[PDB]
Amino acid sequence: QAVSKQQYADANAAYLQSKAAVEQARINLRYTKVLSPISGRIGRSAVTEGAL
Amino acid sequence: QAVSKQQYADANAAYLQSKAAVEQARINLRYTKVLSPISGRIGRSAVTEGAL
């Protein structure tokens, strides 16, 4: 009873939001490495280095 | 003349302060019994026993 159910709610609420954010962060970081989907034969790179 | 006007003043002074305090005390006590404003179907008590 040291704290209202509301407070604990808001708390666990933010906690979930965070855990969410981190997972999304992790995924984006991982992609800073664009790997090849299949094993075929790649050709020209339509995208140039240092491009956006 | 058995006592200065000052003394009687200070006296009646405290008396009023008291009478004041009591009334305020009375009101707070009365508010400890949370009554229903109207009649009808009440819902879920968004507050649990023991909770502040």
CA B31/CA B48 separation, integer angstroms: 19
Burial group, residue A22, by CB count within 10 angstroms (0-12, 13-18, 19+): exposed
Residues 6+ apart with CB under 8 A from A1: B48, B50, B51, B52
Partners of B51 on chain A (C-beta within 8 Å) are 1, 4-5
Q: Do A5 and B52 touch (CB under 8 A)?
A: no
Structure determination method: X-ray
CA B43/CA B52 separation, integer angstroms: 20
CA A51/CA A34 separation, integer angstroms: 14
Burial group, residue B40, by CB count within 10 angstroms (0-12, 13-18, 19+): exposed
Chain A: give the shortest CA distance to residue B52, in Å. 7
Q: Is the distance from CB of B51 to CB of A1 less than 8 angstroms?
A: yes
Amino acid found at A52: L
Q: Do B50 and A1 touch (CB under 8 A)?
A: yes
Burial group, residue B4, by CB count within 10 angstroms (0-12, 13-18, 19+): exposed
Which element (helix H / strand E) includes B11?
Answer: helix B5-30
Structure tokens at B47: 């507050």
Nearest to A4 by CA among B52, B32, B44: B52
Closest-CA residue of chain A to B50: A1
Q: Is the distance from CB of B52 to CB of A1 less than 8 angstroms?
A: yes
